[PDB]
Amino acid sequence: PKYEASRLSSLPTTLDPAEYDISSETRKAQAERLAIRSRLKREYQLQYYDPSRRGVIEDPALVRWTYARSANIYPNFRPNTKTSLLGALFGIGPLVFWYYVFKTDRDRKEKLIQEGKLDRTFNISY
Amino acid sequence: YLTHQQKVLRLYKRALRHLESWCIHRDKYRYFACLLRARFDEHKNEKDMVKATQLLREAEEEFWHGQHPQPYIFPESPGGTSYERYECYKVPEWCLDDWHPSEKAMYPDYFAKREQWKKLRRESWEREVKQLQEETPVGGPRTEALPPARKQGDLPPLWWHIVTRPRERPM
Amino acid sequence: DKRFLKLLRFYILLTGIPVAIGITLINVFIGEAELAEIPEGYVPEHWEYFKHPISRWIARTFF
Amino acid sequence: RWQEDPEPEDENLYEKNPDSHGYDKDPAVDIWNMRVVFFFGFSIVLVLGSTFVAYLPDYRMQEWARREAERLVKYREAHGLPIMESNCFDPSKIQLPE
Amino acid sequence: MLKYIIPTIMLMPLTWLSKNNMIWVNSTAHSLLISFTSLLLMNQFGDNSLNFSLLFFSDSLSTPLLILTMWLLPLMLMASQHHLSKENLTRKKLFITMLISLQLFLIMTFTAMELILFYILFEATLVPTLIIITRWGNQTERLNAGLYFLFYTLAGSLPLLVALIYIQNTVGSLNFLMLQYWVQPVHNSWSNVFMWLACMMAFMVKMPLYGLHLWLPKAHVEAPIAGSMVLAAVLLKLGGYGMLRITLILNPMTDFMAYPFIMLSLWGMIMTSSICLRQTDLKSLIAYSSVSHMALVIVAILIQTPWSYMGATALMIAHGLTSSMLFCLANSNYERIHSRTMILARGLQTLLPLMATWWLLASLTNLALPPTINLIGELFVVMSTFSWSNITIILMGVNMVITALYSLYMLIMTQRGKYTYHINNISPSFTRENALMSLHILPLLLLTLNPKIILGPLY
Amino acid sequence: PNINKFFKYLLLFLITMLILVTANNLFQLFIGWEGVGIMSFLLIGWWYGRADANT
Amino acid sequence: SWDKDVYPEPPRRTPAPSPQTSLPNPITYLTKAFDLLVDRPVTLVREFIERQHAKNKYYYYHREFRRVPDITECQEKDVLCMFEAEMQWRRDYKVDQEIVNIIQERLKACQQREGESHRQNCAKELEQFTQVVKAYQDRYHDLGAHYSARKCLAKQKQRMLAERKAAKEA
Amino acid sequence: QLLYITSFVFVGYYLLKRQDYMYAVRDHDMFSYIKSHPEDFPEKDKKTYGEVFEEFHPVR
Amino acid sequence: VRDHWVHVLVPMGFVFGYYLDRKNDEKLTAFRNKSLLYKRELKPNEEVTWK
C-alpha cells in the first residue's frame, strides 16, 4: 500500500525516492544551500552577540514579506480572463446570491402578514 | 546531508522506539528488540551499495506500514506533553538592566557579579570578532561550525548567548 | 507596573472615599424625599419632582 | 550623496531618570504631568463623573412613566375600563375618506 | 453649546501662551476639565430634546458622541507627547492646535440643528485631519493616504451638498426640528433614487461601507497615533450620526433602496473579518476590524427599528473606545520596536505583564464579551436583524466566530509564545502608557453599570 | 510562580458557572455562558509559551 | 410600600408545622440563630436610620401633565400645535410601555407563585397579558425608529378603513 | 495693531448696515408684490390631520 | 501670578460661555408661560415663570 500524498499531508521524507538517489550534482546543490544559510547565520550572529547593540535586528526577509503581501500586488496585477472571472465570481456573485435569499424571504413574510397568516401574537419588540 | 550510515542508524533507533510502543511490557520488548537487531545484523556487511540502498528503502516502507499511530514521546521532546511548558518562565538576562535601583538593591551580591560578566563580555568582544575574520575564508563561512579560542585568556567566539541562556527550570 | 497600580489606587480613593462617606452621611442624616400629593394651589419647583437629595441638588443646581 | 544628518539613536527615558513616568525628560515636569492626568482623569472625571451619572434625576422620565402607569392601571381596573385600547386616538375626531 | 465651544477655543491661547515645557501639562489638564463639564449634557427628557438655541441642540444621540469626543482630546495629547518630543516647540503647538480645532468642529457638528450647518462642520473636520496625517505621519505613503482620504470624502459629500440645498428649496427648511414635522414621504421615481443616493453615499463612505472602505486601512497605517484615535473613535461616527438623522426624510424609499447596502454590509462584515485573520500589519488589522464592526451599524441604521437604533448607538460608543484602545496598544509596541508587523515581537506577556492585561481586556471587548456595552450593542442589532429576516442570524453568527478568532489571534501572536531573541529594548511600561490604557477601558466597563445613557433617543 | 493568579482564575471560573446556574433570564445566563468559555481559554492556555496550549 | 391593587397577591396560606419525627429540625434552630444574630442587629441599625429621617421630613411629587389637543386636531404643518401633540403622544407611548411591563410582571409572578399548577391557576393573568399586548401592538407596532403621532394616526386610519370595509361586506 | 482692528470695524460697520438694508428692501418688495397680486397667493384652506389621509408604510 | 495666570483662560471661557447661553434664553421667551401644557397663573411675587 503506497503512500498517497495530499495537499494537507506531505509525503514522508523517508519514502521520497529522490531522497536516496543522490548524485554529486545534488550534493553540490546541498552544499551551496548550506553556504547561504551559514553566511546569513554569521551575519545575524555578529549583530545578535554584539554587546553594544540595543534594539531590533532588522530582517530584510521579513520586510520583503510584509511588502509583498500588500504594496507589491497592484503594480503586478493584470486584468485578464482569470482575475476578471475570479473578480466577478467572488465579488458580485455573493451579493446577488444573498440579495435573492433575503429578498425572497422578506417578500414571503410580507405577503403572509398582509393576509394575516403570520403569527405575531406577542411580537411587540423590533 | 545524511550519509547512508546515518540514515540506517536513524531508522534503527526509530524502529526500536515504535516497537517498544507496541510491546509495552519490558520482557516482551526485550524479546522483539533482539529479533529486530538480528534483522539489521544479517545485512551488516553488505558491500554492493545499490543493494544496501534498496534494503534501506524497503525497510523504510516496512517501517511506515508498521509504525505505531500514537508512539511514545518523552514528555519534553517535541510533540510531548511538557514540550515548551516552561518557556513562559524563561526571561532573557538583558531584562535585569531595566530593573529599578531599589530592585537591584535587594541583590547587591548578584548584581556585582553580573557586572563582572558584562565586563568580561565587553573586553572579549573585539578579539572574538577578529578571530572569526581571520579564520573565515573569503566567500564567508560554508558551515555553521564555530571555532574554540586559540590563545589563553581568549573566550570562544560568540559565547554569550550560549553561556547566559535561561535555565531549563528557571523558576 | 506596581507603581502605576498604587498611583491608580490612590487617586481613585482620593475622591472615592470622601464621596462614599459623603453619600452614606447624606442617606442617613438627610434621607430621601417622601411621596406626597401636590397641595391644592401649590406649584412645585422642577427639582421637587425627584426623590433622592443628590438628584434634587443636581437638577436644582445645573439643569 | 547629499549632506543629511544621520538618524539619531532612540533614547530610553529610564537611563537619565529611573523614576520617569514617561511624560517628560524634566523630572519636575514629568511628575506634574503624571499628577494632573491622574487627578483630573481618575479622581475627578471618573469618580465624580460616575457619581454624577449614578444620581441623574430620572433620566428620560423612565421612573415617572412607571409611576404614571401604576396610576392609570389602578384607576382603569377600578372603573372596569380596558387597561389599554387599540385606538391611540378617538375615532370621533377622525374623518375617514370616502 | 457656547459653554463648550468657548472653553474649547480658549485651549488654543492656553497652549500658545504656556511655558515652553508646560504645553502638554496645561493642555491635558484643562481639556480634562472641559470633559468633566460635558456631563451636564445628560439633562435629557423622555419626550423633547435639549434645544439650546436656534443653532445648536442636543439629544440622546448627540450627547454620548459629544462626551466621547471631549474625552478623547486629553487622551490624544497623552498618546502624542512622546513621539513628538524631538519636534520643535512651534510645531508642537501647531499639532495641538489641530487637535483642538478638530474637537471644536466635532462638538459643533454633533449639535448643529440645521443640516447645512452640519454639512460645513462635517466637511471642516477634513482639513485638520488631513494635516495631521500628511504633516505628522511617518512614512512616504502618508501623502497618498491623505489624497485617498480627501477625495473619497469629497466624491460623496459634494452630491450631498446639492441634495441638501435641493431639500431646503422644496421644504423651506433644513432645521432638524422642522423636518421632524414637515417631513413628507419620498415617492418612487428616478429623481428620488438619486436624491436618496446623494443623501446617503457621503455617510456611507465615512462609515465606511464595504466597497468604499479602501481609504481607511491606508489612512490608519500612515496616521500618527492621535490621528488613528480620532479617526477610529469619532470621525467614522460622523457617517453613522449623519445617517441616523437624514433617514428621517427618506421614508418609505429606504424600504427598497437599502437592499444593496445591507447585502454589502452583511457580506462585507464576513469578508473584512476573514481578512483580519491574514493581516500582517497590526494597525491594518485593527483598521479592518473597524470596517466589520461598522458594517453592523450600517445594517442597523438601514432597517430602522427601535432595537436596531439603540444597538447602533451603543455600538458606535463601544467601538469608539475599544478601537482607540487597540490603536494605543499597538502604538506602544511601535514606540519600542518601530515596526507595525504583528509577527515581529512575540511573547510580550513575558516582558510586559501589565500591558498584556490591557491587551486581554481590549481583545475581550473587541469580541464583545457579555455584559460589555460592545456586546449589548452587537446583541441589540442581532435581535433586530433577526426579525428583519431570520436568515441573517447565520451571517451574524459566523461573524461572531470569526471576530473571536482574529481578536484572540492578535492577542496570542503578540503576547504569547516565545519572545523574539534579538529584540532587547522592550523597556518597562511607562506610567503614561498604563494610564492611557486605563482611561479607555475603565469608562468602557463602567458604562455597563448604566447602559441607558449610551442607548440613544429610542431608549 | 503564578499560583496566586491560578487560584484567582479558578475562582473566576466558579463564579461564572454559578451565574450560569442561577440565572433567571437569558441575558444573565449568557453572561455566565460566555464567562466560563473565556475562563476555559485562559486556563487551557495556562502555559502560554507552548504553541499547543495556545492552539 | 406599593399599591396592592396594581401588583396583586393572593392571600398566603402557610401550613402549620406537623412533625412526625423525634429528631429536632435543624432549620428551626438556624432560623432562631438567624433571627438573633442577623435580623435583630439589622433592625436596630435601620431603626436608628429611620429616626434620623423622621427629623428631616420633606416631600417630592408626581408630575402632572395637563391634556393638550392631539395630532388629530392639528392643522397640517402647524408646528406649534404639532409639537405639543407630538410630545404628549411620546409621553403616552412611554406610559403604555410601562403598562405592558406591569402586566408582564404580574404574569411572571403568577407563574413562579403557582408552581406546578401555574398552567391552570394563571389563566386570568395570561388573558390580560394577551389583550394588552394586542392593544399595544395595534397602537405602536411597525411604526419604525422614526415614529410619530402622525405615523401612529396613519396606521390607525388604515386599520379603521379595513374594519369598515369588512363590516360593509357582511 | 490698533489701526488694523479699527479699520476693520469701521468698514465692517457700514458693510453690515448695507447688508441689513438690502434684506429689508427684499422683504419690502416681496410683501408689496404679494399685496398687489392677491390672486397669486391665496390663503390656503387648512385641514387637520384627522381629516387628511396619509398612507401608512409599515417598518416590519 | 505671572506663573499661573494662563490657568484662568479655560475656566473663564466656561463662565463666559455659560453666561452667553443664558443670554440666548432671553431671546427665546416668546412662549414663556404661554404653552398649552405649562401655562398657569403667576405666584404673587413671581414676575416670570423662568429665566
Ligand SMILES: CCCCCCCCCCCCO[C@@H]1O[C@H](CO)[C@@H](O[C@H]2O[C@H](CO)[C@@H](O)[C@H](O)[C@H]2O)[C@H](O)[C@H]1O
Ligand atoms: C457624596 C458627595 C456627593 C457630592 C454631590 C452632592 C452634593 C449635594 C448633596 C445633597 C445636599 C442636601 O440635599 C438637599 O437637602 C435638603 C434636606 O435638608 C432638601 O431640602 C428639602 O428638605 C429640607 C428639609 O431638610 C427643606 O428645605 C425642604 O423641605 C426641601 O427643600 C433638598 O431637596 C436636598 O436636595
Ligand SMILES: CCCCCCCCCCCCO[C@@H]1O[C@H](CO)[C@@H](O[C@H]2O[C@H](CO)[C@@H](O)[C@H](O)[C@H]2O)[C@H](O)[C@H]1O
Ligand atoms: C458632572 C459635573 C459637571 C461639573 C460642572 C461644573 C460647572 C458648574 C456650573 C454651575 C452653574 C450654576 O448656575 C446657577 O446655579 C444656581 C444654584 O444656586 C441656580 O439656582 C437656581 O436654580 C433653579 C433655577 O430654576 C431655582 O431653584 C432657582 O432659580 C435657583 O435655585 C441657578 O439657576 C444657576 O444660574
Ligand SMILES: CCCCCCCCCCCCO[C@@H]1O[C@H](CO)[C@@H](O[C@H]2O[C@H](CO)[C@@H](O)[C@H](O)[C@H]2O)[C@H](O)[C@H]1O
Ligand atoms: C490694541 C490692539 C493690540 C492688542 C494687544 C493685546 C495683547 C498685547 C500683549 C503684549 C505682550 C506680549 O508679550 C510678548 O509675547 C510673549 C507672551 O508674553 C512673550 O514670550 C513668550 O515666549 C514663550 C512662548 O513663546 C513663553 O515662555 C511665554 O509665553 C512668553 O515668555 C514675549 O516675551 C512678550 O514680549
Ligand SMILES: CCCCCCCCCCCCO[C@@H]1O[C@H](CO)[C@@H](O[C@H]2O[C@H](CO)[C@@H](O)[C@H](O)[C@H]2O)[C@H](O)[C@H]1O
Ligand atoms: C467612489 C467615491 C470615491 C472615489 C474616489 C476616487 C478619486 C481618486 C482617489 C485617489 C486620488 C489620488 O491621486 C493619484 O492616484 C494614483 C493612484 O490612484 C496615485 O498613484 C499611485 O497608484 C498608481 C497606480 O498604481 C501608481 O502608478 C503610483 O506609483 C502610485 O503612487 C497618485 O500618486 C495619486 O496622486
Ligand SMILES: CCCCCCCCCCCCO[C@@H]1O[C@H](CO)[C@@H](O[C@H]2O[C@H](CO)[C@@H](O)[C@H](O)[C@H]2O)[C@H](O)[C@H]1O
Ligand atoms: C481650575 C483650574 C485648574 C487648572 C489646573 C492646572 C494645573 C497646572 C499644574 C502646574 C504645575 C506647577 O508649575 C510649576 O509650579 C512651581 C511651584 O508653583 C513653580 O515654581 C517653581 O520654580 C522653581 C523651579 O524652577 C523652584 O522655585 C520651585 O520648584 C518652584 O517654586 C514653577 O514655576 C511652575 O512651572
